[PDB]
Amino acid sequence: GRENLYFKPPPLCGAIPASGDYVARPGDKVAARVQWILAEVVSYSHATNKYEVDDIERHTLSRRRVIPLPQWKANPETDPEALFQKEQLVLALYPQTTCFYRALIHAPPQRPQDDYSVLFEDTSYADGYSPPLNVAQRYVVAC
């Protein structure tokens, strides 16, 4: 998939986080701390500052426990600042699962259609990391 925002990158473009004013919309995908899981927003209450989210199992969560996934992707060749850099700590969706785990960026995408390569934290390996695994841009958020 090509980039979809053309031009400093806005909140929710790639690596740039949501603003403190931001509320994720019904149907939007989020990482939700229940373990961080992939979830879809159902509702928000300004009275309690809580979302209801459904696992992709409904949960009522403080906004502090919900990280919106990025809504836009910029081209790496024009806006590399919108991507996570090598060695950055992120939460990344473990491939073929619905769970997010801490990981280090091995390699950002060099073209818009590419994935990130990441090293998941995993103390079962001597140096404390998994071998590299690919994760889609839409499933990597700041930790």
Place this chain on the structure above:
Amino acid sequence: GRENLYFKPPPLCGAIPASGDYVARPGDKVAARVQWILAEVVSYSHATNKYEVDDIERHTLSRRRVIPLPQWKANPETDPEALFQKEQLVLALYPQTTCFYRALIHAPPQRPQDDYSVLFEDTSYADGYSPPLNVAQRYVVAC
């Protein structure tokens, strides 16, 4: 479907329009003036202030020709101000089609799961309006 925003209503809650800072996100549904049609955002360019949208047929459109559909619904019993009122002029999706036309509100929903009842402008009827037709809340926007 129940209400999904709990509490003045924000932009894109029901009848409240998008702000002038707002850019509809990739995958979001819009009314797009190509005739106003139901379309899905593909991309936005801040260089040209144009969206690319796909009919639900890709079109490149000025932001002035794209009206985002509402993202939130409030409860009519708590926030009737978030609904269009009887006699207001709107653009409404003609039932079972993908085209938006000018209409007058006959009746707002009285419960969150209800539709609007609207009278479409239609000069083929003597008094200039269709008989009443039901349109979902998500498909009525300001004209």
